[PDB]
Amino acid sequence: HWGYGKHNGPEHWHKDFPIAKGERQSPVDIDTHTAKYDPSLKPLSVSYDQATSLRILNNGHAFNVEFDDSQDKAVLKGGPLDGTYRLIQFHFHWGSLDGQGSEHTVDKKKYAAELHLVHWNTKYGDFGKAVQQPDGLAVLGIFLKVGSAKPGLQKVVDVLDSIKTKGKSADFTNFDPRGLLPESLDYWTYPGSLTTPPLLECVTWIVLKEPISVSSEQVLKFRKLNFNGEGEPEELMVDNWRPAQPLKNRQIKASFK
Template identity: 60%
Template sequence: INIGWGKGRPSEWYKSYPIAHGHCQSPVDIVSTQAVYDPSLKPLIISYESCTSLDISNNGHSVMVDFEDIDDKTVISGGPLEGPYRLKQFHFHWGMKQSQGSEHTVDSKSFPSELHLVHWNARKYATFGEAAAAPDGLAVVGIFLEVRVLKIMVLTDALYMVKFKGTKAQFRSFNPQCLLPLNLNYWTYRGSLTTPPLYESVTWIVLKEPIRISEKQLEKFRTLLFTSEGDEKIQMVNNFRPPQPLKGRIIRASFKA
């Protein structure tokens, strides 16, 4: 399934995708004092030991790393999920400046970047595309990035290979375990894809603890382009959707505030 940046800016997506005004749209602003602690939420279990990354690509709206998607060895489980969800890809959102870039916000505060680890319900659905359109099809782990030194040099050093839209390069043996914070406390809610087609098929699991990235590493994301080679160069920045109304949804927390 082609999950892309869509036509025009996010504020115009409703013209092509009426679901943009739906009741379970993402991202949202997480107001920590209004999140409800739910003791029935299980600890989140992330099993990335057998991860096999395949390639890194510029899909015209972000940089994405795809994974071998053939078995249930690379999964998340527990948390708010009924069963295991298999890792498909991860991608980032970032801004032009440090004060903005993340899609989710916490108490109206934005982070410089946000990582999305996208998983699908392979036990119930035959393909990722089928799962992406189903209410319980996807589970996305969102992780905030704050500016400090982080050892993800292998990843940011590969970005030059996918500067232009539509470019792809081999990127093997990268295990995203190194992108996880030590503390897996999380907020969770029912939501949607944050890019068209905006399907309301996502169980969001947003980790409270950020991970770290240096300003120099963040600058490498900003060298990417929304455009193909030969086209007018448009810098890939501010590729995030602003927070959407909660419309009565409850954000649950796995921890006491």
């Protein structure tokens, strides 16, 4: 039922999912002057050398690149986190135009897209149990701006025409997510939620300050995807982002400057 339109988009989600008006919803605007530098925050540890991608899937709301998360192979730790979080999938949110598409904003600036690398806390055993806990997930968010191509993105772009419509999937082995990371791991962090239903309040957000550049041709290929299934009226998969939500209590912390 839910999606991104006039009649089923973000402003409607609260009717099926009442936490949409909850106390720790994401995304949020990151006011860089109000974020508190915390000298006690550690460097983020991203250990993706043994990642095993398996598949790419059009789920009707974005595309997910899925990983084998049945062993510690691609993990996030350090930063603001206690313990170890396993990579389960990544996906993006993007716009119909280069001036919109990100979910988090920086001093109200929208980026063209935002990558989310989704990890679950191994103390809870599996993703499904982790999402039921306030420290269950750690999502690493990375902004995309349009400029030079990101060579490490091109394998993902080139398989999209094989998963054009909702419910399509393709083998996607040997993809290295290190090729999607900017040079700096400086970050902001705050407690929040999934940004799609069920909107569960289980996420430690870690949002990198430095964007990556992708080319106009690469983000063009994202916008050729479809929200509909095969044999249905074509709905381009664009503007699959939730807008910034009220911060309420919450303090955003910065690992730098």
